[PDB]
Tab-separated table of C-alpha atoms in Angstrom:
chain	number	residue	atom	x	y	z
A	1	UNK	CA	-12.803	16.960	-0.757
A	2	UNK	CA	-14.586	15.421	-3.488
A	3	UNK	CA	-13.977	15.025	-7.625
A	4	UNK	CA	-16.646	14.753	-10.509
A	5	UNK	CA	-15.823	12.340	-13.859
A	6	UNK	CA	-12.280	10.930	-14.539
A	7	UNK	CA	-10.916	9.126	-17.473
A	8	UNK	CA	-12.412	5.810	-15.685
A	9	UNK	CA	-16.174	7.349	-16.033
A	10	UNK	CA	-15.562	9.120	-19.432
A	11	UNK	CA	-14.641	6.186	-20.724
A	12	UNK	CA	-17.287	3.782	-19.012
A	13	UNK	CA	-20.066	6.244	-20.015
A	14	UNK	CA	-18.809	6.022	-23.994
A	15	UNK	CA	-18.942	2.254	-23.621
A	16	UNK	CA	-22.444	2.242	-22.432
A	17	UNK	CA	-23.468	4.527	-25.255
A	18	UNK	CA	-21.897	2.332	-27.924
A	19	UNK	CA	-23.794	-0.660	-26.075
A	20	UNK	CA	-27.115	1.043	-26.289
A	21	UNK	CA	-26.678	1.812	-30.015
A	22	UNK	CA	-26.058	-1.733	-30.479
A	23	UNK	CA	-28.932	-2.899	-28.992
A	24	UNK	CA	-30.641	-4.246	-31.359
A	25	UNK	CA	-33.808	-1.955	-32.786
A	26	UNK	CA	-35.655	-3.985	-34.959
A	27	UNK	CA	-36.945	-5.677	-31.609
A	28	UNK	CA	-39.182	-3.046	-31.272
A	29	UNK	CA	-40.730	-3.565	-34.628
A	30	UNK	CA	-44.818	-4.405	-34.428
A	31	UNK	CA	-47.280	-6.936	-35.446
A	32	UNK	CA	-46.523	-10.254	-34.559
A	33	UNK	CA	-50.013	-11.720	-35.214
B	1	UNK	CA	-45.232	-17.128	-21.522
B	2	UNK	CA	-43.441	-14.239	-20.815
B	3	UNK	CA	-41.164	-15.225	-18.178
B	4	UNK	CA	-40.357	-18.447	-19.798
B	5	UNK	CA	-37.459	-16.306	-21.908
B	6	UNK	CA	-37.069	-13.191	-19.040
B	7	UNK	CA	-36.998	-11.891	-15.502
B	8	UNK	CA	-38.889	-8.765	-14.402
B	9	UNK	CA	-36.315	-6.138	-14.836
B	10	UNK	CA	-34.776	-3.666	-11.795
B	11	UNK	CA	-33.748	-0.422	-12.762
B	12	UNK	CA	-33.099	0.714	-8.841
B	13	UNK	CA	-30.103	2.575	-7.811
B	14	UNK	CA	-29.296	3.668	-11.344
B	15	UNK	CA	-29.330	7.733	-12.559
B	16	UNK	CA	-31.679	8.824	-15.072
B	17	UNK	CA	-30.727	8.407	-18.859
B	18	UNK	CA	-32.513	9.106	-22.054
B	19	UNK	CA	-31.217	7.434	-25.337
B	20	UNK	CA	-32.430	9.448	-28.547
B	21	UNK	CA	-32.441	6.739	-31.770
B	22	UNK	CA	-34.350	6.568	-35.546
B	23	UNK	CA	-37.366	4.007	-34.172
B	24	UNK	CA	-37.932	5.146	-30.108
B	25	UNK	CA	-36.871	6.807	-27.524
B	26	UNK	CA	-35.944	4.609	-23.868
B	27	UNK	CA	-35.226	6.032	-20.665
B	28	UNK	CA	-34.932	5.681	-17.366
B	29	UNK	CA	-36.208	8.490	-15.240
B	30	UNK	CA	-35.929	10.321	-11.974
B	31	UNK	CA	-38.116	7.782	-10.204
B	32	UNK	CA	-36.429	4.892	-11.764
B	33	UNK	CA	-39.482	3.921	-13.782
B	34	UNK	CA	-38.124	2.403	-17.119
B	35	UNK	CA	-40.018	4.343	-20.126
B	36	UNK	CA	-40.195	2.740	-23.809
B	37	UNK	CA	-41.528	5.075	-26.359
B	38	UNK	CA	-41.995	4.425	-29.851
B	39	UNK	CA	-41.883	7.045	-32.172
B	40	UNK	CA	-42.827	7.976	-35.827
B	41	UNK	CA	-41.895	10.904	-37.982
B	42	UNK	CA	-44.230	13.199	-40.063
B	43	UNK	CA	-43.990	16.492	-41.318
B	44	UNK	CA	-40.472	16.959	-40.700
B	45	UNK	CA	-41.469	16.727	-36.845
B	46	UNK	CA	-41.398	12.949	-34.912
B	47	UNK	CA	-44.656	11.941	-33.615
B	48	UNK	CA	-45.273	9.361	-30.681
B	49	UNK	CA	-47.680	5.703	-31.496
B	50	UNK	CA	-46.840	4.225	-27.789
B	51	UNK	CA	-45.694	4.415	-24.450
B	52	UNK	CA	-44.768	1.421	-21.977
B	53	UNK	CA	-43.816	2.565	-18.779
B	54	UNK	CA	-42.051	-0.136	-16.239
B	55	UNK	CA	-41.818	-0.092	-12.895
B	56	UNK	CA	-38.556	0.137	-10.795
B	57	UNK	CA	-39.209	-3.461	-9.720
B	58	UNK	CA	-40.173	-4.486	-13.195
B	59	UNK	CA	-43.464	-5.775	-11.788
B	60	UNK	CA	-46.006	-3.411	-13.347
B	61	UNK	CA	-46.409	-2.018	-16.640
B	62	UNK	CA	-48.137	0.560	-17.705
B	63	UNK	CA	-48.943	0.969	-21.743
B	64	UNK	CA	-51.111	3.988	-22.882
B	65	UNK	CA	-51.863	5.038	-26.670
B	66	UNK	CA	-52.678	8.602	-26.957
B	67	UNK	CA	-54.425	7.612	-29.904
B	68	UNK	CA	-54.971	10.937	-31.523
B	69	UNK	CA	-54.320	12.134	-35.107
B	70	UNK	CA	-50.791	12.858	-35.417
B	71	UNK	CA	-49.822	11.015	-32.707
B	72	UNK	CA	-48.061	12.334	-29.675
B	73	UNK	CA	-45.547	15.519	-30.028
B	74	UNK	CA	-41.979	14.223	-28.889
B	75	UNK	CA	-40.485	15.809	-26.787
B	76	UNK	CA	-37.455	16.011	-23.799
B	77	UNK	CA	-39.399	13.856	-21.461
B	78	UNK	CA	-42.032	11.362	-21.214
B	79	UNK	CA	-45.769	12.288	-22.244
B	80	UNK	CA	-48.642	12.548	-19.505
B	81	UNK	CA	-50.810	9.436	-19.848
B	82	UNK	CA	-54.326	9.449	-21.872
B	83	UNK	CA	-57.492	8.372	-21.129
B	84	UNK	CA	-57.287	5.284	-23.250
B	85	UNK	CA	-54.466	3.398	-20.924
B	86	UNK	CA	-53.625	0.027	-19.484
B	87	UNK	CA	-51.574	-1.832	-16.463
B	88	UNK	CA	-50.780	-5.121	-16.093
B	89	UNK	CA	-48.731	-7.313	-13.548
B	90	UNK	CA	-45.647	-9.162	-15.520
B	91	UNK	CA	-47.189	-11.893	-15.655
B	92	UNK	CA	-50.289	-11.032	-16.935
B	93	UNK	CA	-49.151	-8.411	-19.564
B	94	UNK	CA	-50.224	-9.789	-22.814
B	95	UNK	CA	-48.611	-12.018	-25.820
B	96	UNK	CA	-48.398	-8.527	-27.587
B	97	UNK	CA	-45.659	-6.093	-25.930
B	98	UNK	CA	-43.556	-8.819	-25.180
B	99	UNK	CA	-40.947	-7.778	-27.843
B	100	UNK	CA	-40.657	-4.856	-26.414
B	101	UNK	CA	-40.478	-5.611	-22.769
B	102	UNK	CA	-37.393	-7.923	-23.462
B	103	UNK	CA	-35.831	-4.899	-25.115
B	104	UNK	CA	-36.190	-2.707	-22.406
B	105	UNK	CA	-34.906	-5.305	-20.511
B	106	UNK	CA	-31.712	-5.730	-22.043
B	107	UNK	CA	-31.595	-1.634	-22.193
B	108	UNK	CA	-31.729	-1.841	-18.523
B	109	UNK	CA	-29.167	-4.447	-17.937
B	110	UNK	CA	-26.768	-2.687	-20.342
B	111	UNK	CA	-26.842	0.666	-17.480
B	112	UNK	CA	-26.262	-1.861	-14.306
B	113	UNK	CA	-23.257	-3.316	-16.343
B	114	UNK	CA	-21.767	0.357	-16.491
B	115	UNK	CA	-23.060	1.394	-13.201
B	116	UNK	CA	-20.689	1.867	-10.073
B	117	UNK	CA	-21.693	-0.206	-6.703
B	118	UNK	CA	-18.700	-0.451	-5.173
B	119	UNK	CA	-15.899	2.273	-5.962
B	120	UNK	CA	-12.834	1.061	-4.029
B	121	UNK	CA	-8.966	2.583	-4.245
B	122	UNK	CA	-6.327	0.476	-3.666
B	123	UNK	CA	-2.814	1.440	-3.465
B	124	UNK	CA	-2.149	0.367	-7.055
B	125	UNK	CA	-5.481	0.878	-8.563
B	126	UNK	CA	-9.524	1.810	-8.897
B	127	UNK	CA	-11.342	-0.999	-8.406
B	128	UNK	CA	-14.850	-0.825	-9.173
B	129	UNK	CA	-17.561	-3.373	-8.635
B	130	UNK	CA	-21.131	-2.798	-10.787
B	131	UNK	CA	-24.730	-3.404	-10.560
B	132	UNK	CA	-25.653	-6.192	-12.412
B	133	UNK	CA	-26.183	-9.046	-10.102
B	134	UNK	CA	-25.500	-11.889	-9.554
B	135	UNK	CA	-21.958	-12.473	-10.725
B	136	UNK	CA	-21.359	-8.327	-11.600
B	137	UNK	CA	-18.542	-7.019	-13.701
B	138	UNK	CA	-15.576	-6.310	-11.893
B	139	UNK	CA	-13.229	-3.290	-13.962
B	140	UNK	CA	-10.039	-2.602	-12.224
B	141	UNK	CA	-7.727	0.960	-13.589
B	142	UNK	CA	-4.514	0.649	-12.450
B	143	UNK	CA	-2.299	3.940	-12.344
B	144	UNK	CA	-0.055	2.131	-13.733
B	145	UNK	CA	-2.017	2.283	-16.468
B	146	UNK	CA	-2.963	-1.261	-17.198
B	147	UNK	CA	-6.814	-2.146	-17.302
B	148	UNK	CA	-8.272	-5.284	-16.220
B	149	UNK	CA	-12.137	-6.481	-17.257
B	150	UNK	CA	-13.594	-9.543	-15.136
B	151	UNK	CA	-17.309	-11.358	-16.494
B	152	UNK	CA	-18.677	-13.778	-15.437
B	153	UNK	CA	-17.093	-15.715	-18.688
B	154	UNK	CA	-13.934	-13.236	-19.760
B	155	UNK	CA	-10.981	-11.846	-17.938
B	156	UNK	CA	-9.963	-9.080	-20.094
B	157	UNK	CA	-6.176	-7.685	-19.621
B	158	UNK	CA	-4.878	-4.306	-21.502
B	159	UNK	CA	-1.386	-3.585	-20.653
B	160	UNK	CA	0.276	0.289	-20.840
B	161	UNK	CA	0.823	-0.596	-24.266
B	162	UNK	CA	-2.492	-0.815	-25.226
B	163	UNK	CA	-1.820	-4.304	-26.153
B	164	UNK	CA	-4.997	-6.156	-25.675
B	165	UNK	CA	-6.297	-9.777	-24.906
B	166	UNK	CA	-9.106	-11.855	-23.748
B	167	UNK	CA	-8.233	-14.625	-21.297
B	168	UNK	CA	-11.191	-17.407	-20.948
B	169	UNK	CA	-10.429	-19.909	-18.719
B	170	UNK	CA	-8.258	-20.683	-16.137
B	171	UNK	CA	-6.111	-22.633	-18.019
B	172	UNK	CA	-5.927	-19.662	-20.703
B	173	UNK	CA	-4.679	-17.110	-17.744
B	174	UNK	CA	-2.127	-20.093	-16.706
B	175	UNK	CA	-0.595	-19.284	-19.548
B	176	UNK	CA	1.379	-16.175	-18.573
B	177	UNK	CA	3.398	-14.089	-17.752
B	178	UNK	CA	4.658	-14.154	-14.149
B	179	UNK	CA	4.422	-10.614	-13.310
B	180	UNK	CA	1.123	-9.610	-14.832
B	181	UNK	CA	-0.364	-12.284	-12.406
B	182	UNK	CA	0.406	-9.991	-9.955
B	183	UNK	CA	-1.921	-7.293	-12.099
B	184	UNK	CA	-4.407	-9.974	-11.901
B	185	UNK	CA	-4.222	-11.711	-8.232
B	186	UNK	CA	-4.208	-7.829	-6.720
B	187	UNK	CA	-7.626	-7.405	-8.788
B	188	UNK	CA	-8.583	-10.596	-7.511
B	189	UNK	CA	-7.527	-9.687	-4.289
B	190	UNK	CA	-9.675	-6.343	-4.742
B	191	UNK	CA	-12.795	-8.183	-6.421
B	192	UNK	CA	-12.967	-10.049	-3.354
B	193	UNK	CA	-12.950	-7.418	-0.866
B	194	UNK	CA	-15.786	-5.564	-2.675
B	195	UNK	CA	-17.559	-8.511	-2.879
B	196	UNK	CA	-16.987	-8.901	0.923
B	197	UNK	CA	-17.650	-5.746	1.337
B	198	UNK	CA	-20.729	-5.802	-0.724
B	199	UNK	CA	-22.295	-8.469	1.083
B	200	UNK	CA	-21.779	-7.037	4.786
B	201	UNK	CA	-23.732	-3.612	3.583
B	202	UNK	CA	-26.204	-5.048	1.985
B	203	UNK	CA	-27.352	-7.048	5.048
B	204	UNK	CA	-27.385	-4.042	7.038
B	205	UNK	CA	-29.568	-2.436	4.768
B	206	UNK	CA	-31.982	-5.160	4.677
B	207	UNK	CA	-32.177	-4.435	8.468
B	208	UNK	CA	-32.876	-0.852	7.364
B	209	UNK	CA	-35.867	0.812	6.097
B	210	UNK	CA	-33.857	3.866	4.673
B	211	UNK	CA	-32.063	5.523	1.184
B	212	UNK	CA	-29.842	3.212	-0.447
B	213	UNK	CA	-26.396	2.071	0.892
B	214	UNK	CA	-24.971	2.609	-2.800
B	215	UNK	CA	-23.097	3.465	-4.452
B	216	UNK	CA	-20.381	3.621	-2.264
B	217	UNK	CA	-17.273	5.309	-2.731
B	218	UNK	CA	-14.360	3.852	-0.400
B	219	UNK	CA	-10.923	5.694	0.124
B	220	UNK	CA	-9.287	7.870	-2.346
B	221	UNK	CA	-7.058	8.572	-5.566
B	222	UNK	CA	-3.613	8.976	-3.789
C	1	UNK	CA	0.204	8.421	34.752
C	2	UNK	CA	1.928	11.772	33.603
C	3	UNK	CA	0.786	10.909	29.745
C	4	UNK	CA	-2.956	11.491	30.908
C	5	UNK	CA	-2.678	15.032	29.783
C	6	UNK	CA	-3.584	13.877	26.951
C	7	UNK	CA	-3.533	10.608	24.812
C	8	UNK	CA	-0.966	10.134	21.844
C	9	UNK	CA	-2.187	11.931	18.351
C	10	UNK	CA	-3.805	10.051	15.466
C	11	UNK	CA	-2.548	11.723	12.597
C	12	UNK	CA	-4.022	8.887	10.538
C	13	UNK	CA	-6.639	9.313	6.845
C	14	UNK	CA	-6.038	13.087	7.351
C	15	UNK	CA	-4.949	15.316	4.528
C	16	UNK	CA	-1.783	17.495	4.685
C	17	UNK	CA	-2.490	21.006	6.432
C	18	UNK	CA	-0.594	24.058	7.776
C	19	UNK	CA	-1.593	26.553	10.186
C	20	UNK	CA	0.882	29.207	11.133
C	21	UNK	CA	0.452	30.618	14.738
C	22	UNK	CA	2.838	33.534	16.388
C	23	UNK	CA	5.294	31.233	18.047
C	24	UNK	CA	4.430	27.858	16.309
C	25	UNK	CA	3.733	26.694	13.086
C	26	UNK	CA	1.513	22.957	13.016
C	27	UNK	CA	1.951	21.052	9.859
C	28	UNK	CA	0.356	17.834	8.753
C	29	UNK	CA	2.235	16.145	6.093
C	30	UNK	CA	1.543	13.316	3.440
C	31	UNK	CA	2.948	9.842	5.359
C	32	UNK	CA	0.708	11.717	7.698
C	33	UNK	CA	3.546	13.045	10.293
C	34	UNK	CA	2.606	16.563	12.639
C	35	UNK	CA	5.130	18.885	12.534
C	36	UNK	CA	5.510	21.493	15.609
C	37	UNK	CA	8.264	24.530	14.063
C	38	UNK	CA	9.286	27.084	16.785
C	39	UNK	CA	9.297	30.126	15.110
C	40	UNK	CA	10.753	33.261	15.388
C	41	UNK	CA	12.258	36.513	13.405
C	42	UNK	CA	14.735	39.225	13.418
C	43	UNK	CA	13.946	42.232	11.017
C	44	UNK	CA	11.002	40.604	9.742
C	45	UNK	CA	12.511	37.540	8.273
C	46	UNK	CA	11.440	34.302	9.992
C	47	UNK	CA	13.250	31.061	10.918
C	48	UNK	CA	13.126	28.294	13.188
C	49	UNK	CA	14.954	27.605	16.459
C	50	UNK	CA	13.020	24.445	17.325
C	51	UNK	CA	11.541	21.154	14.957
C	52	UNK	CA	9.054	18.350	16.727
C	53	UNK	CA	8.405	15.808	14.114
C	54	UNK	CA	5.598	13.311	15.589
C	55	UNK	CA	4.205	9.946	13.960
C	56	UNK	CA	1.152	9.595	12.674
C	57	UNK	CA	0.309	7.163	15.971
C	58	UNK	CA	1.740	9.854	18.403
C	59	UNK	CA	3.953	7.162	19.718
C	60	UNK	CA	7.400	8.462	18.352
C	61	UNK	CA	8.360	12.000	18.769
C	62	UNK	CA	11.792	13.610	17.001
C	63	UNK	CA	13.597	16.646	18.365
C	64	UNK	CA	16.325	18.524	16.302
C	65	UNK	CA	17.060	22.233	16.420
C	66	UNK	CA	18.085	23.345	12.615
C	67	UNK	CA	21.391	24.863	11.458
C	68	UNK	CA	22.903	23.590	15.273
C	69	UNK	CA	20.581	26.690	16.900
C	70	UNK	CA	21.552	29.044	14.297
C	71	UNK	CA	17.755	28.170	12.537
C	72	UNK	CA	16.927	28.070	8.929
C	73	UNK	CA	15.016	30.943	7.536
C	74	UNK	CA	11.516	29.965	7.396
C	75	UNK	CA	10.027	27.840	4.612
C	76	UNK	CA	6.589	26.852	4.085
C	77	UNK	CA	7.963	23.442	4.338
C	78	UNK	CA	9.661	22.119	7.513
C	79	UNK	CA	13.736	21.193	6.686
C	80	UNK	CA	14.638	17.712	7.100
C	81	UNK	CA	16.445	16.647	10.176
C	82	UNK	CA	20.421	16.414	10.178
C	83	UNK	CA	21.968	13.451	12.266
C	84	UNK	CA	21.871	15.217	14.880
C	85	UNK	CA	18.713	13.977	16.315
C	86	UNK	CA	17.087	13.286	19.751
C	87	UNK	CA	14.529	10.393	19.959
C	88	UNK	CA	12.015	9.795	22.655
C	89	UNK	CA	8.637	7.450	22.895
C	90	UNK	CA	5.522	8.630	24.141
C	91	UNK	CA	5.482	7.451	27.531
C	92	UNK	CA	9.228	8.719	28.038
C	93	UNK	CA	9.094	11.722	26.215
C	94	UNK	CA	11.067	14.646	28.913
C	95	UNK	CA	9.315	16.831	31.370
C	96	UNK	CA	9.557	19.657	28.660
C	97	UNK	CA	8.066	19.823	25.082
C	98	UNK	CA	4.272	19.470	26.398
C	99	UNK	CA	3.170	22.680	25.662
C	100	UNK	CA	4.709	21.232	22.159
C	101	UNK	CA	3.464	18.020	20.816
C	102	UNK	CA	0.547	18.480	22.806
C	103	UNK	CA	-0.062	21.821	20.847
C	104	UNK	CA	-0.131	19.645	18.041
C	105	UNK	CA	-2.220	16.968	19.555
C	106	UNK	CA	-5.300	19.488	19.835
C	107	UNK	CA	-4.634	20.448	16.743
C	108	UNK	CA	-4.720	17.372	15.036
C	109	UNK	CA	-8.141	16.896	17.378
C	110	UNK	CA	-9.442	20.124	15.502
C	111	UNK	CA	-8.768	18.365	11.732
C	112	UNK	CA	-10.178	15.130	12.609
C	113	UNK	CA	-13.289	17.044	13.871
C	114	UNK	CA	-13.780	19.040	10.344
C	115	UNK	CA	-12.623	15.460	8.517
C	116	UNK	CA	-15.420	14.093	7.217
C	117	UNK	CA	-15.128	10.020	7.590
C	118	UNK	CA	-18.451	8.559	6.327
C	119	UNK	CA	-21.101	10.728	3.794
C	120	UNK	CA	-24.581	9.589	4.039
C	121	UNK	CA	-26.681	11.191	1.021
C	122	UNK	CA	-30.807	10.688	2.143
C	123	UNK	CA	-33.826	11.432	0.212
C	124	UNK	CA	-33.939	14.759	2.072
C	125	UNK	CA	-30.468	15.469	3.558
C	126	UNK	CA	-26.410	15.076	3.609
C	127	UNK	CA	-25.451	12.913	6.913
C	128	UNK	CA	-21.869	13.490	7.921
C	129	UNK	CA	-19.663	11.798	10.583
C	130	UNK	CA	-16.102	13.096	11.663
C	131	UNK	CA	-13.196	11.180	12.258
C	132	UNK	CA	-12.718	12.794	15.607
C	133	UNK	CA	-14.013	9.908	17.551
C	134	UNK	CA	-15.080	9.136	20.266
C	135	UNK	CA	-16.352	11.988	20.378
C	136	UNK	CA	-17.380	12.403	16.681
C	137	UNK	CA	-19.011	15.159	15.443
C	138	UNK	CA	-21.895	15.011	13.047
C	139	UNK	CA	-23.080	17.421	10.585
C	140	UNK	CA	-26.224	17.333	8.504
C	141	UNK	CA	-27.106	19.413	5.181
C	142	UNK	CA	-30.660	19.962	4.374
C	143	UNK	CA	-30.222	21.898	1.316
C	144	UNK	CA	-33.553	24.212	1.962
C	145	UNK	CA	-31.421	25.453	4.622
C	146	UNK	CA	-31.757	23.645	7.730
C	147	UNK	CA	-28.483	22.148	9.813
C	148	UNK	CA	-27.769	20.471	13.256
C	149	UNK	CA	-24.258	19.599	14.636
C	150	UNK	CA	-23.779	17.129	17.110
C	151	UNK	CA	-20.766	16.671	19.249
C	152	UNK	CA	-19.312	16.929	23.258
C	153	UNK	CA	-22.559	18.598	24.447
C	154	UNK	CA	-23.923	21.386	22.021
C	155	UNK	CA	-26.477	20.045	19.489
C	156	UNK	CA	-27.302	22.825	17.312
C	157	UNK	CA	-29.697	23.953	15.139
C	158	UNK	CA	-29.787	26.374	11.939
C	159	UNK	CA	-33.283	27.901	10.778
C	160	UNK	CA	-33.009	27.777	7.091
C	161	UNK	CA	-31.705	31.199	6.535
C	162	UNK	CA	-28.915	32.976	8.002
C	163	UNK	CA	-31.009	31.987	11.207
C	164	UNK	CA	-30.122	30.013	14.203
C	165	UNK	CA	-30.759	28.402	17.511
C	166	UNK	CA	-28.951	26.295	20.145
C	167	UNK	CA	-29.593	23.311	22.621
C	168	UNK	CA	-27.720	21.803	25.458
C	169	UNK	CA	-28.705	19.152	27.388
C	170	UNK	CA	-31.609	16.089	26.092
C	171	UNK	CA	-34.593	16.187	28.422
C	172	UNK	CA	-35.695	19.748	28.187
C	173	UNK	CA	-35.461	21.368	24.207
C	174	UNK	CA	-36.264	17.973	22.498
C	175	UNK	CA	-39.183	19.086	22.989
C	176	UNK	CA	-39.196	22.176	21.062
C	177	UNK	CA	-39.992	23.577	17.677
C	178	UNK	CA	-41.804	20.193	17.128
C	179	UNK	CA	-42.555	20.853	13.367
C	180	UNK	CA	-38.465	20.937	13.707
C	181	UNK	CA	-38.299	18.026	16.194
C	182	UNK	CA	-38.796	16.032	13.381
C	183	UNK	CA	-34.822	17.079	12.773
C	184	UNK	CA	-33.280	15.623	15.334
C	185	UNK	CA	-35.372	12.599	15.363
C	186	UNK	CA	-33.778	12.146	11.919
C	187	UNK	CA	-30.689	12.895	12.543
C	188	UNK	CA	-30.445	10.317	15.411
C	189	UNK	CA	-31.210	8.311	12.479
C	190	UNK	CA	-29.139	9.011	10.685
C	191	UNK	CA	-26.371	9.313	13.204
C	192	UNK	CA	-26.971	5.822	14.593
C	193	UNK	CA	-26.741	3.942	10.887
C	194	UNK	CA	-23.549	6.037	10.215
C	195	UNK	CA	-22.192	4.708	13.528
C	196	UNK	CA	-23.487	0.957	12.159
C	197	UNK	CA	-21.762	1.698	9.409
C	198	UNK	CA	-18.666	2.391	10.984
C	199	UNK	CA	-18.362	-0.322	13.443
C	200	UNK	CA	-19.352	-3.288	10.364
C	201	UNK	CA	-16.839	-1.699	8.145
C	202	UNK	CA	-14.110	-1.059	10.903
C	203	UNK	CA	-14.149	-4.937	11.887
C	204	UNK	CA	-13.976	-6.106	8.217
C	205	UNK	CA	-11.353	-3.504	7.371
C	206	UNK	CA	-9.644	-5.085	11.243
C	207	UNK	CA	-10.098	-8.649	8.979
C	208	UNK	CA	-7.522	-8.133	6.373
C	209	UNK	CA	-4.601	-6.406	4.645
C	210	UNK	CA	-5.282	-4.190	2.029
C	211	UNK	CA	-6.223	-0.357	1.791
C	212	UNK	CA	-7.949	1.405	4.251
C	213	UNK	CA	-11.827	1.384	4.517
C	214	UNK	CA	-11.994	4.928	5.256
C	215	UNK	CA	-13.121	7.495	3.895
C	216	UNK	CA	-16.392	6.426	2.328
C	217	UNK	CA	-19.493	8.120	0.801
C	218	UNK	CA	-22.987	6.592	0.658
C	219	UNK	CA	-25.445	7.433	-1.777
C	220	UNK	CA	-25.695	10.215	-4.718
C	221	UNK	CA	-26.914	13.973	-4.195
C	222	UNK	CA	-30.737	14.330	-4.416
């Protein structure tokens, strides 16, 4: 009686991945002093 | 101070995740702890100079350096702590990290903006209500096939056609056209109910001491 | 108070189902309607003398007899009605067709008691509650084997493997198999939050218009 991933999650979980790749990286860079 | 730019982080509710990239590796795990882990390569093979580990509430923070020739060995999942290790409360972690915690941080606000809370199916669409409070982002799939985006700032309409818009204020979605106000009043319509809905649950588990009430799923694809 | 043989049928949130018996074939359709076919064959071809069509509130019951008695070899499908039709309410409904309808009623009893209405995911188990209320039957999956099914009278009890027990009555066996008593005691758990559930989300769903509040699952699988 239940379903797994439909367009709607497919989708949602692509738009999260292109989110995390734009999170910025260079925020993680060291030595502030 | 830290907390002057940010707000402890909560990573609750949401599944586990690991994110691969050139500089580190972050990842939330099976206990909802928030792991940041900066990695180096060498040899051909990526080596490990740091590990901050957050907890679910985003109060403590635990940052060990398995300071070691070569670093740590990367691998699938999160390294057992050294010897040579730290924890701090948020407010007390130091000037130094502070870069880092803010990106983990964001990291973790990115998941609860694409994380269910409220699945609800309407006769006309899939409404879906996410995690990151206050003022969550409200995504509404009709079968019809148009999609509708609500922010806290945007309304964001894409007909069957694919044709796509951003509407602003409420003056910008004034400006329409009087039949695909019925595409947005019925996600209105929907966005309150969850957040009715929401709020009702939510107070019953606060009378609870038991697993989490979400995500929910209510009703189904007909 | 002839209708106290039993109360009208709530065909309501149940999927469509067919069981086929020697003389009568039950049907649940989509817009929810039961459908009692009196069935019988010559030379191993089937048909039906006899169609009760019943709402999905019990309320209204229809009465035609296919192909004016001649019957309709049998489909897996009931025919539609012609115009000629007989009509009756509940309360009114003739002396006859109570072994009918009411064939259907206990059947519809059965669905609602395997139709799961709210799914409670814990740390440990899989809480859920039936739509046949009042008397609502709850099942719980432990996935290292254990289960416990409470209804009318029998709460039972599986050992993890292929093994089982029984109970009847709650003064004596409670107290039994305490390193298991710690079942029930968490089953009445979860049994009375799945019944808090259902009353909070019944009176908001009583509130308003839109789609119905029911089915719902809470929580992810551990």
């Amino acid at each position: 009686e239940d379903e797994e991933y439909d367009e709607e999650d497919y989708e949602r979980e692509k738009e999260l991945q292109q989110l995390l790749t734009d999170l910025p990286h260079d925020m993680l860079d060291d030595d502030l002093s | 101070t830290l907390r002057s730019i940010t707000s402890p982080l909560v990573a609750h509710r949401l599944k586990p995740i690991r994110q691969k990239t050139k500089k580190a590796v972050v990842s939330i795990l099976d206990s909802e702890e928030v792991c940041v882990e900066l990695v180096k390569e060498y040899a051909s093979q990526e080596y490990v100079k740091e590990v901050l580990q957050i907890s679910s509430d985003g109060n403590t923070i635990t940052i060990y350096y398995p300071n070691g020739g070569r670093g740590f060995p990367l691998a699938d999942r999160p390294p057992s702590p050294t010897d040579n290790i730290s924890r701090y409360s948020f407010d007390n972690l130091p000037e130094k990290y502070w870069r880092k915690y803010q990106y983990a941080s964001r990291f973790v606000q990115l998941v609860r903006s694409k994380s269910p809370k409220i699945t609800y199916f309407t006769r006309y669409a899939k409404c879906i209500l996410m995690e990151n409070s206050p003022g969550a982002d409200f995504e509404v799939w009709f079968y019809d096939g148009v999609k509708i985006h609500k922010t806290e700032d945007f309304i964001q309409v894409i007909e069957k056609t694919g044709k796509s818009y951003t509407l602003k204020s409420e003056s910008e979605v004034n400006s329409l056209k009087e039949e695909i106000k019925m595409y947005m009043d019925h996600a209105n319509e929907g966005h309150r109910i969850c957040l009715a809905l929401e709020s009702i649950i939510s107070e019953e588990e606060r009378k609870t001491r038991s697993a989490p009430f979400f995500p929910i799923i209510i009703g189904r694809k007909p």
